[PDB]
Amino acid sequence: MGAASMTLTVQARNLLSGWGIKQLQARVLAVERYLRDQQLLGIWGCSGKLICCTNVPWNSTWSNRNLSEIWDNMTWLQWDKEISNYTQIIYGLLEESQNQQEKNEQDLLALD
Amino acid sequence: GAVFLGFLGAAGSTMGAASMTLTVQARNLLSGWGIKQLQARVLAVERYLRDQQLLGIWGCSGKLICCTNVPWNSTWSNRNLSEIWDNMTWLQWDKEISNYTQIIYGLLEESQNQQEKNEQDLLALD
Amino acid sequence: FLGAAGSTMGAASMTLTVQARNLLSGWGIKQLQARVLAVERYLRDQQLLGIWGCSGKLICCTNVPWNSTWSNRNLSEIWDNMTWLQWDKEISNYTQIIYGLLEESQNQQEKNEQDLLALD
Amino acid sequence: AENLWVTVYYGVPVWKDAETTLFCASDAHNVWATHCCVPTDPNPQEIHLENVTEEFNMWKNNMVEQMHTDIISLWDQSLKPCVKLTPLCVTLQCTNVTNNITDDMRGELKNCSFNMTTELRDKKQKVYSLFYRLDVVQIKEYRLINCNTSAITQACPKVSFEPIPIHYCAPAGFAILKCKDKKFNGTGPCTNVSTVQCTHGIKPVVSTQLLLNGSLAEEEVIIRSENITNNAKNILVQLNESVQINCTRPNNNTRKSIRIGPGQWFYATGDIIGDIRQAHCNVSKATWNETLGKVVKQLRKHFGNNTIIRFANSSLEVTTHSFNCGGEFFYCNTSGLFNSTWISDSITLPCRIKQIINMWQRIGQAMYAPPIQGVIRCVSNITGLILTRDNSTTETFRPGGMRDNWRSELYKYKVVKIEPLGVAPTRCKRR
Amino acid sequence: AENLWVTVYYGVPVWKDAETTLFCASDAHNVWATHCCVPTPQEIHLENVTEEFNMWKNNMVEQMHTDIISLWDQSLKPCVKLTPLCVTLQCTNVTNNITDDMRGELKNCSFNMTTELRDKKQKVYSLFYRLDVVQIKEYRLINCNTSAITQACPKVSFEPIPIHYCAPAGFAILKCKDKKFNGTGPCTNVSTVQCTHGIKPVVSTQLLLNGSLAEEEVIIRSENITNNAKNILVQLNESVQINCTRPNNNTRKSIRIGPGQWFYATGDIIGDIRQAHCNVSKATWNETLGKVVKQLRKHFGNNTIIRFANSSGEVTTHSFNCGGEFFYCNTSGLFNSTWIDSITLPCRIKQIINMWQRIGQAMYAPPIQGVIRCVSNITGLILTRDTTETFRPGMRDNWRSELYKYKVVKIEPLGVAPTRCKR
């Protein structure tokens, strides 16, 4: 998955590019899908980033493969399938961690 | 239907607790013959973007909670923190100070413009 | 709003916010299309800034140098006795060279930051 | 707590009253079935707002106005791509149908003949059909009630106009606040408020005077009106028990399909296989008498405990009890249901049938309801009443009432707009 | 000179010429009022901005033209089609105290019309203008068999209430404030506006009614002054008031023509029958031409004799609508003599209107009930040209004369420039 992620921009850019109602539906949908993904990154504290670290530990429940093998002789398509039943879980955890982190920062900033 | 849970659950709670459920409200924005439905969808996007643009203008992009460098004026509200927080609900707060929101928003933009310039001048060697 | 259009850059650079907030606020299919188009144009510009390290900024400084083949002027020449309209004409070309460079710099910067974070 | 600073919060749980566009949603050939294209669960989840008091107002509820508009618009849309009966706007020659007819009906049905077009423009055919008296007028030549006003479109026999529950759902950024207060009169503060995405499911039943198949009060009879002392306003009465009513058209009818043009068909009443009997509806006596007494008790609560309450009849569409049973239109008499004075086994209501139907008080449009074969019977639940009022200590109430049918179901809901940004003072400032 | 880096700025005041769709707004049964439902006065001066404005290459006019045609065609879609009226009319002369100048003007026509209920016919009659029918006492309607004629719904008003065109988000309208600007080229007094502030969509030929006035001088504009293939648009700095009347007390004869359809016929005329003329003050007209000529000479010479001539062989007349009726006024009494108390002009009336420049899709204008008067302002003229020179009286130009000062531009807020900062 390393080589596959050397650049995350070529596939990130131009996702907003270019009776007749169906053409509007296609355009409206493209915008909505774009915004939904950006919305999710924002609430996880990853706005503006393609790669971000978080404070949610990785569970062996989700996967018990080591970093070797996961990140090398494998790709993203089967990876996504292997952990497809945990995405709701992970997203919920990311949301909770971000909310607590912002509160903690607000308090530290107020204290000094 | 997993997302629509706890939405406005904190509405009757005090501000002190409600401030910890911001994600829940935020995650339910957007989301959710056929001649009026596109207007409904377009509007949801437009309202969303207007709020995000405004946070961007104020230098709060990417945050649910952002601190500014603008002092609070006692003329907008002369209450102490212990009477606002851990006492009032957000609805009660919104029914008050509603006459000063434009004032606050305007001066927040001016503050950010000063900051954008100061950063450009101080990012330079000096 | 555009009152600063005839002012020189650096003066006309003040209160950029007035021109930003007014980009979103102030048979029937044509109006529906107009609303969609304004949204798409807004987002195309925001994505372009967003892919650079300029997300949420009005003034953004980055690591891409001038090679002095584009502007072909010094700073007194550029930031005085010159409007933004004139400047846009003076460097109407090279636009995408710069955009490509800004993206490459940002991708490299992000990768370097993630390794520095991890290796600590 | 001095030298406080502005902090901006996004995702703040507040709202303001607002009007917007609602979506049609449903559970899991029909006018609403092909409109609600969004699946949703019946009995959607509610989020209770534990300490929220909110102001509700059943009147000036835009949800009602939007529903009224949606029902009419869908009706017109489904009726649009159907056979026009302009070729039927001809002089008729009619006689009486008196072959095996009981009394109180002579003159109700007529045997009418006319010269109709065929597939070719140079050919004509002699055809005949039966018509109901209410739709046929003197110029023994007769005219239809149409032509004098407007054109008539035949309803497509292939599409059902039966109500199904439909749910109204908020667009993103909006929310529906539902009042759970067991007994409120349509206005004022509500102290038990929950948030939902969709309404409970309302059947768009169209009727007059008596409200059929609605939601019953869970406790007592609830009387609601915009202004109870203003005789110009209607009173909506919500019952806590249903009164069951048996409606029927006992005659076994046939349908005569006539080709009038190039794939253009007219569906005529053919003939009657059995004898001719009057359409009617049956209400149990004990149930009605007690139901009415419950209403009276609640009226005394507002009009005096020493007053006299009278029920009198109405002053066609708003005079009789209109409903659609089995797909056929009925105009039933209510006399005998409102025939009493209250101081300190069943009833039969005769019914008339029209085939030409105009709707929502519009004049410029008309629909021809094709006949249906066989015998019609349905059973409905009377869930509420629409009543009106006329120095005196004796007060007379009468049946009455367009939008009241929906206002009576949407009373628990309010639509609000979410306003996620706000500011407040704190001790946090930027470095 | 050294160590400079790229920075970007968002909210930069730049723009480019652009073509977009503008939307309509209005200030508070009218055809435009129904369409222009949006309610609506900001203007920002640009102190040091010079900009290029144009005409004839200006797309705002094209949008207005299209919107007007569209609105009219849409408006007539649900109205009664006078399909069953291509019948032979039995027409005799109306002789009821008809004056000498219109002896052959009106016809009394009877015919067999279809009734509702399909089976019967009715004998009805109506009055027609001599310009509405064709003799073959045997008459037929003009051009009913090249096109069906649609009756305008009598309830719809076409009063030219001011129309405001407003920019969509991301766009702005620039205005030229140069009081003497000769149509096109650079303008050094420029401001930005949100809306055009209200243009009355008045439709006419030869004379432009109820428009804008110049503030200081009569302005003569043309794409090519030197050619004879362009119209000259003349904007006056003072209006000329003109009265019009149709003094014939006709009534509306309502005929049911089908199952919910009505035709509105001209009924019997009450009283004597007279022309429907218009009145222009002599002094105002004589001075107005003198003002035009003094400015016109700037392109022709001060020793050049300038003559005004009559119409060349709808357009050879002054077409306008007033009170809902269509007028065709004779302007031969105007535009006379050479340069180096009132005049009354006769007008004709027509009921079958081929709007703009189309062959079919004709409209029937129902008669108005009673008698009308209208008072209008002549605000400009459209003139053409053939030693000495002549000028003669002569749809987009009606709007070019109102929108010459407006331009639409697209805002492009993202800019790039060098400075001394980086990270």
Added chain:
Amino acid sequence: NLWVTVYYGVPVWKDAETTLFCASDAHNVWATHCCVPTEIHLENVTEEFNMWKNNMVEQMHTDIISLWDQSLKPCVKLTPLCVTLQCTNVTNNITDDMRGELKNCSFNMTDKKQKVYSLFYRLDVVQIKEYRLINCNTSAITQACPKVSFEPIPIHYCAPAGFAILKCKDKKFNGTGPCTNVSTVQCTHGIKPVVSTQLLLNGSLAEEEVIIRSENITNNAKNILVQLNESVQINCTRPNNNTRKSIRIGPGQWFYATGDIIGDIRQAHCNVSKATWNETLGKVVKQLRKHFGNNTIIRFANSSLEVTTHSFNCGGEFFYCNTSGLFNDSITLPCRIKQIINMWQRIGQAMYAPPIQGVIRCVSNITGLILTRDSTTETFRPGGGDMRDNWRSELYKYKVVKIEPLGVAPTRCKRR
């Protein structure tokens, strides 16, 4: 030890059904519709394709029908054609079978009642010397506007943003299963929306061998689509030099009638070289036997109007032909010309196709066949109808997927 890292721009996709739009390179209904003007190899991608579950096919079917109705809708309806028609036979210089093929008819059109005459093909008219125009009595017949062209032009289907089209490059892909040579495109190759039955005209050829595809090769209820690796040229002509007669209907409404034939009357026909056909059929059977068994000798049979005869739109005029003799120097197939067309499989509204003046000649490429099944040796017959198979033959290599560029993976880092 490990933490969740969030990645945006992740190269992951899922099967999806969306709305695609039309594009082209430069009066024609597709030219006025396809206003949009107009590859990457994936090194280790093995994707599953299924041409019979491909919704791109349904999109074409729907778009084409809608485009046709949209174009024919705003044209004159031939209301006054449903009149008693009076007819006699054409006897003027007819080459022996067109005896009884052409009729000379007259009628009274909307005093009015104007008597007019025109010629009709036998297949257009039904008896009640008293006649009626076929099917005018069951549905409205409208006249196609003569200014509208239905000539097929290449159509490219393009993905909306967020979607991509995967293409199978496997030289022998048989319509289902995994493909190990997958590339991504934004737009498909151009497909000409040629409408025909039995023989598929002007498509793309197989690159190496004949490819025989079906949902189930042993199920005789399904059609077999055969893609050839070489084209067969077919030359179709309508030899008669006719003229057109303009008849006023009403207030600017005109009917276009077939006028009299100038010169001799000859039979419409199509022809194919014998050697080419023989070898072509030989290629098909060599490979067809791989699914049905060896020890077999070549044998075919003819068909069971649009299904039993070949149908195409020739030069803008609907043309039908007898394929018997292809399936049992050159072979000539007799042909018939017809007006009053019920498109696809509808039995509702019909279009009247006005005549084209002059002799019509068209030459096209046979690129594939639709065959059905009748030890028992070979028993195959031409099949056809539905017209979705006509697009399956071009779209079989394409699939639409949704891109979902966001996901997570464990990493060694932690946010500070």
